[PDB]
């Protein structure tokens, strides 16, 4: 009887907390490049991470719009 909800809730959060880790990785990569600003592997490892960060932000920035539009369509009917 304990609210047996058969649904995958919290996915938006599970995703967002993943992207935030990529952000931390990007900052750390920047620090390593800063200390060795001529190292070709430090550079490659910086843009590979940065591209992924951009790719995923561009994904949730779309999904979040969809989710926002759904919720805003609910509070508008039972105000």
């Amino acid at each position: 009887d304990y609210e047996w909800s058969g649904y995958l809730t919290g996915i938006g959060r599970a995703f967002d907390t993943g992207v935030k880790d990529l952000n931390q990785q990007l900052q750390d990569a920047q620090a390593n490049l800063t200390k060795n600003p001529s190292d070709p592997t430090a550079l490659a490892n910086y843009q590979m991470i940065m591209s992924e960060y951009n790719l995923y932000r561009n994904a949730q920035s779309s999904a979040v719009k969809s989710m926002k539009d759904i919720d805003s369509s609910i509070v508008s009917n039972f105000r």
């Binding site: 996915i11 967002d16 920047q30 600003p37 910086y46 932000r57 999904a63 759904i70 009917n77 105000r79």
Partner: protein
């Protein structure tokens, strides 16, 4: 006269009133901030659209039509708001007044359209009952004023005399010049907008701009002498034939009618009921059993009427009430006292032988239709009591389809009643409401308050359900419509039918076949040109092949709109708002499940359930299906061999269809299922379509229902004791073998299955669901068909994030899915009450698992608490919302690559993108996310509702992982939670991310459970003196980590002799303080460390490290990063005593190479060998190393050193990798060339690298184009490889030829699990990238494989030659 003065209430309608604080509980968002954002948008939109009187929207008949494009999801019915003077606009589902402005958006559950209309602008001329020309939904042009003007015989012969009458011609009709009306012979009567023909005396009203009085005159009263003298008979004929709507009638058919009634003025406060009129309320209160307070005339003025139930007096404007009619009371005060909000009261406070026979029949028919036995049409099977008169405000969605051409158009009832001519038909699915529709029509006619139908003199509602094909009309109507076998005879009826013709309407229900019909009626269908009697026949789509031959168009009933479902529930209930509110949210998010309520019969199914549990504040999404098929047994039952048989056979069809994603069947697919298409029960589950097609097809009622039936059938197979029909259940069950689909595509299926009752199926299903995610073979089975998603947009969205989650953090994905499947298995066991036979599977599953804290709220852990000891850990994260400023772009890369910029030509220029645009676009997208996440509320852990609620005695949580990230200060509730949870565990591990001040507020809890803390990992966290003192009082610490910013020069190192249990030490400080210079000399004694991860610098003869290792025989991981070191050979020698080392990492300028290689053969347990950054400038050392690597048979990760030694002897290293049958990762750095790189491919063919996952080649400065083409064409077999990196530094870009690009695209498709390809500094033109972007769609790992080519360096390349 200034229609309304254009309402403008400061543009602050607001609508809300802080009633949303309870909604955030369901949504997770602050509904208050959200409402504010919406208000702003509405204010802006209003200023961009037109305001003022709109004459075209003057008729409510048209206003209703404008809502045919209104969204199906709402709280208000178009009819309710159309009646309030509103019409639909094209902007964001907003509505607007015809008389007034007042642009209003959305809807509510606690407000009606009229309540808002008079709240945001009470001065509206319409609401105040001023003459604004409002036209009733049901109205006609012919008025029948029955009043003659002055001596027009002479007075109005001249045009001037006629024109002079139009002095007060209302502004609301000034689109038609009075000069035209005058020319046509019309004069103004003084009424709202009617005019009278000066000769004929006929009167027409409801004039609209664009009307032509000569055409209107020709259609009604065509015999008028004036018209005949002025226009040719040909012109008159053309005007009539050129009209639209009425087919064979004129003014004479709307007058002298036996069902006429005068109606007041279409006032605003006339919701949607017949009883809105005083005359109808009063002249119906006839059965009132002489109860005290018999002022019926006064009662009627209270908006009250008799429902037909003993003493229930109902109000047309608010519903059933006044039960037991208090004797001697006053209905105006009782009504007000009980319902002090009713719009009606608010308005009140503010303010010829056959001919005579036909007449007698007419009166009897009217009495039969308005009687309280024809009304209260058993809607929703509520009761014989509990009046449902107020529920007759919902209509059906009707469309008109042509039988020949593929043409379909939407209709509203006012446009149907005006087109009734010869033979018409209404088609629909079983339960669509076609029987109620026919009765409603007969009712409106009898009432007489519905002009447009008042032209009919006789209306007969008959049911051809068992009538024999030889019975005459008199013998039928005397049985079904009249009280006794009298009044009429067969000859009387026939004589009447052939005299009235167009004025006689039959409503024929329950039609089956043309043969099984009374001969007297069949003749009115087959030869309906010698009579012209109007017939309306209602059929199921399972037939409707018999009468199409006699039609032109068909009226088809479409899906019953969601907003009608909401209204019905709102009116019947509302006593339990917490249940209705959940209903609205559920179907808001699950957009495709709105299709469940397709047929009114499903709405009845809900009501029947909601009346049994009126105070249970929960919405069960499958209750409607369980109810629907229960009530099915109360229609026309035959449980044995019929009901069970039809459900079983249909269930088999559904079950097969749901695993091939069919949802559509032909006749052969149906026949093999054993379904009889001519059975009556197999029409309440499924519908047949025989429309203009070469071949027919079958479809189940709204698809969600098919899944329900499939679920039901699967259970029967699993429970049955017949092996022949039982193993089949397992066959179908095993079709679900992908954890990616069990959380999406099959989500609803599984929820229906784990809800229906079962006996043996329970254990059989849970043993599967807990197996699917048990091992790593099925857990990693990422697969989808994408067919089940085509019709379900809400799942397509859900899976958009899951595919992403899997790529960013696979561990999060696996943990999340695993926990979900556990819940479904437990739910199943509890719902079926088979827990005793399911627990063994759960216990097997739980072993070694990690669950979240909230998983302990599951009842299972209370009933069987010993299972807690099987878990490895509980995860308890806290996040708060601390800011992490930014990525900080264009501050480093801007001082790096300048002066080394490449010179790319015009065609390959796209390889390099500008940084300024890259950053701008990213920043915009990031902000759009932040503004949403800020509106979310985490919700503190509800550790009470079963939460390990064993007032814990014998069992404890074996390990608690506390993950603290981006939080500073915890509130009191969190302190209560942390203390409660901490005392419930045996081992506490603290992971502290950037969270300054955190270990100051939870002190009260740590001080009680000091000895339970075993790990403390510190990230970018500043430590205070008080914090360090607390840490030094945690004597049980086994693992201590400091990953940065410890520059406090505090006692954490000086007092590193208190942690006597320490086994794992990890030190990596951004600020270099030469750690170990600060560690006591007594530390390297008795500790026996297992992990040493240290970043050290400027140490000399560091005997402390040597001693620490010497006394650590169980050392597993050794990472050493430092500058100039001493006695390296001694360190390498000492490590030989550590026989269990699995990982070695040496990556700085201290490594001496030779002393390493000499000792390397003594380490045989190594799994990871990382020497990146080291150099081996020696062929002899290199060769020895290369051979040693072949002995290290356990290596998974081999990261090679660089330098000349390896370059010269690289082939040996690659060839020996055929012995290392476990390699997962290989990384090369400037070691391979054109001749040696191909050896990788050769080994893969020979049988090596079979498990390789990551192959990194950044060596590409020493390889030419030929070395890649030859490599790609030689690579056939590496069925584990996920990432292939073949990239170069931007200063040495490679331009690919067509044959190289082609070779690559072929190579990728031979690597079936590849998901990442790196190609930086490769130059491809617009046609080459267009090849790879197509190849991707033929790749097994579609929607994953990503190719990285572009550079984002902060400069423009020189694009010239």
């Amino acid at each position: 006269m200034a229609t309304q003065q254009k309402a403008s209430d400061e543009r602050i309608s607001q609508f809300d009133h802080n009633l949303l604080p309870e909604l955030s509980a369901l949504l997770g968002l602050d509904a208050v901030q959200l409402a504010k954002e919406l208000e702003e948008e509405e204010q802006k939109e209003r200023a961009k659209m037109q305001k003022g009187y709109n004459s075209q929207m003057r008729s409510e008949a048209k206003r209703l039509k404008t809502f045919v494009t209104y969204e199906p999801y709402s709280s208000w019915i178009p009819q309710e708001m159309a009646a309030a003077g509103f019409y639909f606009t094209g902007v964001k589902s907003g509505i607007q007044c015809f008389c007034c402005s007042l642009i209003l958006f959305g809807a509510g559950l606690t407000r009606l359209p009229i309540e808002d209309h008079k709240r945001f602008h009470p001065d509206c001329g319409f609401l105040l009952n001023k003459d604004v020309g409002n036209i009733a939904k049901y109205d006609i042009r012919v008025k029948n004023l029955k009043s003659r003007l002055r001596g027009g015989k002479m007075r109005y012969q001249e045009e001037e005399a006629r024109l002079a009458s139009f002095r007060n011609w209302p502004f609301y009709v000034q689109g038609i010049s009075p000069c035209v009306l005058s020319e046509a012979g019309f004069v103004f009567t003084g009424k709202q907008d009617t005019v009278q023909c000066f000769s004929c005396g006929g009167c027409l009203g409801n004039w609209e701009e664009g009307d032509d009085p000569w055409k209107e005159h020709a259609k009604w009263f065509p015999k008028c002498e004036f018209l005949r003298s002025k226009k040719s008979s040909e012109e008159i004929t053309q005007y009539i034939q050129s009209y639209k709507g009425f087919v064979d009638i004129t003014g004479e058919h709307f007058v002298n009618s036996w069902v006429q009634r005068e109606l007041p003025m279409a006032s605003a406060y006339c919701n949607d009921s017949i009883f809105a009129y005083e005359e109808l309320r009063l002249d119906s209160f006839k059965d009132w059993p002489r109860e005290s307070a018999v002022g019926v005339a006064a009662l009627a003025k209270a908006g009250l009427f008799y429902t037909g139930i003993k003493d229930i007096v109902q109000c047309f404007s608010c519903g059933g009430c006044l039960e037991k009619w208090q004797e001697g009371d006053d209905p105006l005060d009782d009504h007000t006292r009980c319902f002090p909000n009713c719009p009606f009261l608010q308005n009140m406070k503010s303010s010829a032988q056959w001919f005579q026979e036909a007449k007698n029949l007419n009166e009897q028919l009217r009495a039969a239709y308005t009687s309280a036995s024809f009304r209260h049409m058993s809607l929703l099977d509520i009761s014989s009591d509990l009046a449902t008169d107020h529920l007759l405000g919902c209509d059906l969605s009707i469309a008109s389809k042509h039988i020949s051409k593929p043409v379909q158009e939407p209709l509203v009832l006012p446009e149907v009643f005006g087109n009734l001519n010869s033979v018409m038909c209404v088609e629909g699915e079983a339960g669509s409401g076609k029987t109620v529709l026919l009765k409603k029509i007969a009712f409106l006619w009898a009432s007489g308050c519905c002009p447009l139908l008042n032209r009919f003199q006789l209306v007969f509602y008959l049911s051809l359900s068992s009538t024999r094909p030889d019975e005459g009309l008199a013998s039928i109507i005397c049985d079904q419509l009249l009280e006794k076998e009298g009044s009429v005879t067969e000859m009387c009826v026939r004589n009447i039918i052939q005299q009235l013709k167009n004025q006689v309407l039959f409503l024929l229900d329950d039609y089956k076949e043309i043969c099984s019909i009374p001969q007297v009626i069949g003749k009115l269908i087959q030869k309906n040109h010698l009579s012209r009697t109007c017939l309306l026949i209602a059929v199921r789509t399972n037939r409707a092949r018999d009468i199409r031959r006699y039609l032109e168009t068909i009226l088809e009933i479409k899906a019953f709109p969601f907003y009608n479902t909401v209204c019905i529930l709102r009116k019947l209930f509302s006593h339990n708002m917490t249940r209705l509110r959940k209903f609205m949210v559920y179907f808001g998010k699950n957009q495709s499940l709105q299709k469940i309520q397709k047929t009114p019969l499903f709405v009845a199914a809900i009501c029947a359930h909601w009346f049994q549990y009126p105070f249970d504040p929960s919405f069960d999404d499958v209750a409607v299906f369980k109810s629907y098929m229960e009530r099915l047994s109360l229609r026309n039952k035959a449980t044995a061999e019929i009901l069970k048989a039809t459900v079983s056979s249909c269930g088999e069809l559904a079950l097969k269809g749901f695993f091939s994603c069919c949802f559509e069947f032909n006749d052969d697919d149906l026949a093999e299922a054993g379904v009889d298409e001519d059975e009556d029960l197999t029409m309440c589950l499924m519908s047949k379509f025989t429309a203009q097609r070469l071949r027919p097809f079958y479809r189940f009622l709204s698809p969600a229902f098919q899944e329900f039936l499939a679920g039901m059938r699967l259970i029967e197979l699993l429970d049955s004791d017949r092996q022949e029909h039982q193993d089949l259940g397992l066959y179908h069950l095993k079709q679900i073998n992908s954890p990616m689909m069990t959380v999406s595509a099959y989500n609803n299926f599984l929820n229906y299955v784990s809800s229906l009752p079962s006996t043996k199926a329970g254990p059989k299903i849970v043993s599967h669901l807990l197996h699917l995610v048990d091992n790593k073979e099925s857990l990693e089975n990422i697969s989808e068909n994408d067919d089940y998603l085509k019709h379900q947009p809400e799942i397509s969205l859900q899976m958009q994030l899951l595919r992403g989650l899997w790529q960013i953090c696979p561990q999060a994905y696996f943990s999340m899915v695993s926990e979900h499947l556990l819940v479904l298995a437990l739910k199943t066991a509890y719902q079926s009450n088979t827990v005793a036979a399911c627990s063994p599977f759960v216990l097997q599953f739980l072993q070694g698992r990690t669950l979240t804290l909230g998983a302990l709220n599951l009842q299972y852990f209370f009933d069987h608490p010993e299972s807690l000891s099987l878990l490895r850990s509980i995860h308890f994260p806290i996040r708060g919302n601390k800011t992490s400023p930014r990525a900080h772009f264009s501050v480093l890369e801007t001082c790096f690559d300048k002066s080394q910029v490449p010179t790319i030509d015009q065609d390959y220029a796209s390889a390099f993108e500008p940084m300024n645009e890259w950053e701008r676009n990213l920043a915009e997208k990031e902000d759009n996310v932040k503004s949403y996440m800020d509106m979310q509320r985490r919700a503190s852990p509800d550790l009470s509702t079963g939460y390990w609620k064993l007032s814990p005695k014998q069992y404890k949580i074996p390990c608690l992982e506390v993950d603290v990230n981006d939080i500073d200060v915890v509130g009191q509730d969190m302190l209560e939670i942390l203390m409660t949870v901490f005392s419930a565990s045996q081992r506490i591990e603290l992971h502290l991310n950037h969270s300054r001040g955190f270990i100051e507020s939870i002190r009260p809890a740590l001080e009680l459970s000091k000895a339970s803390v075993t790990k403390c990992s510190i990230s970018k966290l500043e430590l205070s003196a008080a914090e360090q003192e607390l840490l030094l009082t945690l004597p049980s610490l086994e693992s201590l980590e400091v990953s940065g910013t410890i520059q406090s020069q505090d006692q954490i190192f000086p007092n590193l002799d208190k942690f006597l249990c320490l086994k794992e030490l990890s030190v990596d400080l951004e600020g270099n303080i030469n750690v170990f210079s600060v560690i006591p000399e007594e530390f390297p004694n008795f500790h026996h460390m297992e992990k040493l991860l240290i970043q050290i610098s400027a140490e000399y003869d560091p005997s402390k490290l040597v001693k620490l290792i010497q006394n650590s025989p169980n050392l597993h991981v050794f990472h050493l990063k430092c500058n100039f070191f001493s006695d390296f050979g001694s360190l390498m020698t000492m490590l030989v005593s550590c026989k269990k080392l699995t990982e070695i990492k040496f990556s700085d300028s201290f490594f001496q190479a030779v002393p390493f290689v000499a000792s390397l053969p003594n380490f045989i347990s190594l799994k990871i060998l990382n020497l990146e950054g080291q150099q081996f400038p020696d062929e002899e050392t290199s060769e020895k190393f290369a051979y040693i690597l072949g002995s290290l048979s356990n290596l998974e990760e081999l990261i090679l050193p660089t330098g000349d030694g390896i370059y010269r002897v690289a082939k040996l290293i690659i060839q020996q990798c055929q012995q290392l049958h476990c390699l997962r990762v290989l990384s090369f750095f400037k070691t391979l060339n054109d001749d040696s790189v191909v050896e990788i491919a050769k080994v893969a063919i020979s049988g090596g690298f079979q498990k390789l996952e990551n192959l990194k080649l950044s060596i590409n400065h020493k390889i030419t184009e030929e070395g890649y083409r030859n490599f790609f064409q030689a690579l056939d077999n590496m069925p584990n490889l996920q990432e292939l990196d073949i990239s170069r530094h931007f200063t040495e870009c490679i331009k690919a030829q067509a044959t190289t690009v082609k070779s690559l695209s072929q190579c990728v498709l031979r690597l079936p699990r590849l998901i990442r390809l790196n190609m930086l500094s490769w130059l491809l033109d617009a046609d080459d990238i267009a090849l790879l972007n197509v190849m991707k769609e033929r790749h097994p790992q579609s929607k994953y494989l990503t190719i990285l080519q572009k550079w984002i360096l902060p400069f423009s390349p020189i694009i010239q030659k």
